[PDB]
Design a protein around this ligand. Sequence first.
Ligand SMILES: OC[C@H]1O[C@@H](O)[C@H](O)[C@@H](O)[C@@H]1O
Ligand SMILES: OC[C@H]1O[C@@H](O)[C@H](O)[C@@H](O)[C@@H]1O
Lengths: 320, 319
Amino acid sequence: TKYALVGDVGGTNARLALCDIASGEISQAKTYSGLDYPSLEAVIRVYLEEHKVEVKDGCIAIACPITGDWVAMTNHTWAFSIAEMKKNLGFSHLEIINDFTAVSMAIPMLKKEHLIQFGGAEPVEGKPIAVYGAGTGLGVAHLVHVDKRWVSLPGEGGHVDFAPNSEEEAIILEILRAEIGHVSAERVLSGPGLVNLYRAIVKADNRLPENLKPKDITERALADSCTDCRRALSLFCVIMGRFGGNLALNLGTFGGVFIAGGIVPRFLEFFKASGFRAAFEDKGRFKEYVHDIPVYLIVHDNPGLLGSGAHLRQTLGHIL
Amino acid sequence: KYALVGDVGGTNARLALCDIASGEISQAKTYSGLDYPSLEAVIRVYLEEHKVEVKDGCIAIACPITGDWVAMTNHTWAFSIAEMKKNLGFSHLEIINDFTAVSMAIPMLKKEHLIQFGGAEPVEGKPIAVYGAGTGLGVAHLVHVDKRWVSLPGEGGHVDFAPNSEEEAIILEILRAEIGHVSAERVLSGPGLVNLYRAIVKADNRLPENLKPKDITERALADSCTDCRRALSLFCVIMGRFGGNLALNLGTFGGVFIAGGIVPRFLEFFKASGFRAAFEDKGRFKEYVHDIPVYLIVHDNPGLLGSGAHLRQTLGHIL
Ligand SMILES: OC[C@H]1O[C@@H](O)[C@H](O)[C@@H](O)[C@@H]1O
Ligand SMILES: OC[C@H]1O[C@@H](O)[C@H](O)[C@@H](O)[C@@H]1O
């Protein structure tokens, strides 16, 4: 039984792949729309019959809290019982994990080409790792090396309070608080949050935001067509740095801080020139605590899939 | 039979004996840092007074523990762990952060050392966060990895202050103008209370007094100063909110623990406060933290206890 099933579901998209159990290598990736199938189980059935593979074991990352046996997505209508699904497909193992648990578990598998460093020096081996990423949501997980085991620590850290550093970011906080209630980091660091930032800068200035999508703000910011857009993106990069630096301090993250691509590669050279690193380190006397911690942009295309394979293989008894 | 354990913070160094077989602490004594040129000196005084031979120690210190050089901000006192180990002739000399120590105590605390503030029951083997406001703001996490609890130190007290209202933002900007970066510790700590009090005053366009942290709690509890009362109220809410962020960030279904620094001296005020609703005030993620218990630790020496646990475990004992 050479392959296990691996997957990465985020709102409407479900990508399934094969992981070679011996090497952890990913192959035969294929994507489906969630709108076209009534459940994750149905798309797995289709994927498996459609290639011609027999699997016993699988691991699927989902972009929502995995809190127990019943999983209900927020950004799509799928809702399912893990145990019910494992039974129905006849698997021996069926791990459902959070998407950032999966991304954290890809970290040990990542090599230099997959990483772009933004500041700091070198990781201190065996020391904790933080991973986060702004996409549809703000994801955060942590990773620690205990013995020979990579231990991911999943959370919902994208939902902590947003911490403004300026009178300006504070007016933005007020505006968003006036309109929604609790303002989380996710409210500003994500696709939707980039748009929240734009609307709020424009609104702070008593003007009327146009109905822009995240790709629009990014598009105009890079093109220089919109100073509001460029301000939104600039602030986003700054809040991004501060947020990651907070994670570095909170768990003593000398093994490094990882950003899981998401929206960021869409604007790599803008990010590269931004205040990101300097926001990362802007921690008063604690600048020196975080100053040598490296940040890496993860640029693998499918870290969720890789991470799912890694998580499974460790569960299967393998050492990475 | 005996090992040396320690709890060094600021002005003071508390030293005691730990029974290596049971983990019990005895002969605790608290020395003033000002009266001594080094922690090593203090240790020699203590070990001279007590008539036991000790080759093993663990000292918890209220500062980041990176490598071999340990630099105290609240005293100075800076030292080499390797050098101290050598000078004193120890087999093992473990030097840990103070919240590392407190986290190591949690697994041996019994219901009398705990006072619960909301939520339900811990989910067994799930992560724990511990924090506490004292001379500084400490944070550490504990995770259950392969049959044992593992301590995750850090400097989580120094992350940005995250104001949730227009008023706390006004305080943020007031503190931002006077100093730079405003960390959570700027507001959740003894000195934090003074900062809150000053900022509350300046914001009502008045001039603050040169008050001390115990001044704040006294006048609050005596109800003899509406600015001090207000600061304390606000401290309780920020404390709840800060604890809620910790729980969200590491999924701490194991529970959140507060190490009593300044809190027990206003215990009933704290119980009456907005603490728990602030802890839970997380938008749609209210439900994620609603069942996570908070416990105040009322054990008098969690640092000494946890230094002992840390050392005994290092010496091969299963806890
Ligand atoms: O997609 C990244 C993150 O988005 C958040 O809104 C969800 O609550 C997390 O579970 C997820 O990891
Ligand atoms: O004493 C509580 C905390 O205070 C902070 O100021 C120090 O940086 C920490 O190392 C310590 O754990």
